[PDB]
């Protein structure tokens, strides 16, 4: 029941000592299903440090302190094992390999593109798959609708402009425009499809008056000649 | 499949036109389309049936 | 990431080509206008 988020809400509300999530046998064990070993760098570890530093005063009303100390012992043991493996890795380095540049350029571009979940090439009907396209379009829409509007830029070429305390250089909004062109092109996607349907169904509905090899055909010329036959009168 | 279209007529003319130039160079067998239509045992059975009709009408 | 970090730390790659946009986004000041809103 969001045991890692309840401590964050109690830290943001500045009232983590009056309730302290009320860790008991029926409350601290229901939200955990021993803490579940969070995987953040410091966003969920400093909260555990503060949660240990606050509860040093009651000293008996919370029973998960032993599990938190065992988790800290596991973290220290993993840190010591990682330092011994880092020493073994730095002592196990061969002297000469002469690593090339082209394979490095192949690895860096692919590892940069695989960070932010986009397509990378190798260079080494159907409604079931359209919902999967719409779920990726709406994902980027909901991602671009969470950016702050007060976004400014700073390039490495501004030092020739001599920006004073009140200067207003003309290279501040070079990324705020590009953060809106994508957001308003993902919304006009259904707008351009109507123009494409009005264009293709007007340039391809005839297809036998401007294209020469389709109007120079023996079947098509005879058909266009024979559909214009006026009905014969009687007597 | 009841009606024909422009692409169907063009593909029909093209498949009827390629098989004529394919037989001059003799890179295709075209014997299964020959023997199954000639069928010499069916031809001699046809001659025996016409002889039987001669024997029945005389 | 650790392997490509240790290659740079140990093998001393001779070129290490720089491919960056030479820019990074920051947060700028927001402020409301000083002319009052008429109704």
């Amino acid at each position: 029941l969001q045991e890692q988020s309840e401590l964050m809400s109690t830290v943001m509300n500045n009232t983590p000592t009056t309730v302290a999530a009320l860790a008991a046998v029926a409350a601290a064990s229901e939200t955990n299903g021993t803490i579940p070993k969070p995987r953040s760098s410091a966003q969920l570890e400093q909260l555990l440090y503060r949660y240990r530093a606050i509860q040093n005063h009651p000293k008996e009303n919370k029973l998960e302190i032993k599990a938190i100390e065992d988790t800290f012992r596991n973290i220290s043991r993993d840190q010591d094992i990682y330092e011994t493996k880092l020493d073994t890795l730095r002592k196990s380095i061969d002297k000469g390999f002469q690593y090339d540049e082209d394979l490095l350029n192949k690895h860096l571009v692919a590892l940069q593109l695989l960070e932010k979940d986009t397509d990378v090439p190798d260079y080494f009907g159907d409604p079931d798959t359209e919902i999967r396209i719409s779920a990726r379009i709406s994902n980027r829409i909901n991602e671009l609708e969470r950016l702050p509007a007060n976004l400014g830029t700073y390039s490495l070429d501004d030092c020739l402009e001599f920006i004073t305390k009140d200067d207003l250089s003309s290279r501040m909004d070079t990324f705020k425009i590009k953060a809106l062109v994508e957001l308003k092109s993902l919304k006009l996607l259904t707008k351009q499809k109507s123009i494409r349907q009005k264009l293709i169904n007007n340039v391809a509905s005839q297809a036998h008056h401007n294209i020469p090899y389709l109007r120079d055909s023996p079947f098509t010329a005879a058909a266009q000649r024979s559909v214009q036959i006026r009905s014969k009168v009687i007597v | 499949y009841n009606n024909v279209t422009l692409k169907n007529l063009t593909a029909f003319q093209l498949l009827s036109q390629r098989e004529n130039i394919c037989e001059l160079l003799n890179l295709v067998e075209s014997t299964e389309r020959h023997n199954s239509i000639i069928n010499p045992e069916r031809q001699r059975m046809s001659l025996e049936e016409m002889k039987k009709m001669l024997d029945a009408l005389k | 990431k650790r392997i490509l970090k240790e290659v740079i730390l140990a093998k001393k790659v001779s070129k290490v080509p720089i491919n960056n946009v030479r820019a990074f986004p920051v947060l700028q000041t927001n402020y409301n206008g000083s002319i009052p809103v008429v109704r």
């Binding site: 860096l108 571009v109 940069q112 260079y123 | 160079l25 890179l27 | 491919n19 960056n20």
Partner: peptide, 26 residues
């Protein structure tokens, strides 16, 4: 973890003899 420009990504990213031998003959 630094981004790379798009201009570098876009910069990095028996049937013959079957007729001759027949055309020589026929």
């Amino acid at each position: 973890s630094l981004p790379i420009e798009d201009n570098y990504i876009r910069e990095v990213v028996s049937k013959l003899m079957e007729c001759v031998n027949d055309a020589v003959q026929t």
